[PDB]
Design a binder for this molecule. Sequence first.
Ligand code: NA
Length: 129
Amino acid sequence: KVFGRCELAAAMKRHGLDNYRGYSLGNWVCAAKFESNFNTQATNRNTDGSTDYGILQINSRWWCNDGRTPGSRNLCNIPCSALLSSDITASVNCAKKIVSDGNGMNAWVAWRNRCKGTDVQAWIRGCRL
Ligand code: NA
């Protein structure tokens, strides 16, 4: 599923991501924009052989099981395929664990490079929320 900008903002809010660990909804929408272009089916292979999955490009190295990332963990207790669903519940639940891990949204390198310190409220501007 390719979400609309305001459609995804509403789904993230419904699942309690808005101001989760102090990150406003615009921060989450901005991170999804640059990670996946709002596409739940987005995948990207890392040089290390791990894979990133879903709207928030969650990595098999630590967070999900894909059976092809030697030495990896599954700290969200999910198959990585759950992160590609039209329903964002698994991505949101796992992102809450990631952003609680100590480095906040710096875990998402695209958030650090493209979202951090920018006018992230622009990402929810005009949305009925
Ligand atoms: Na894994």
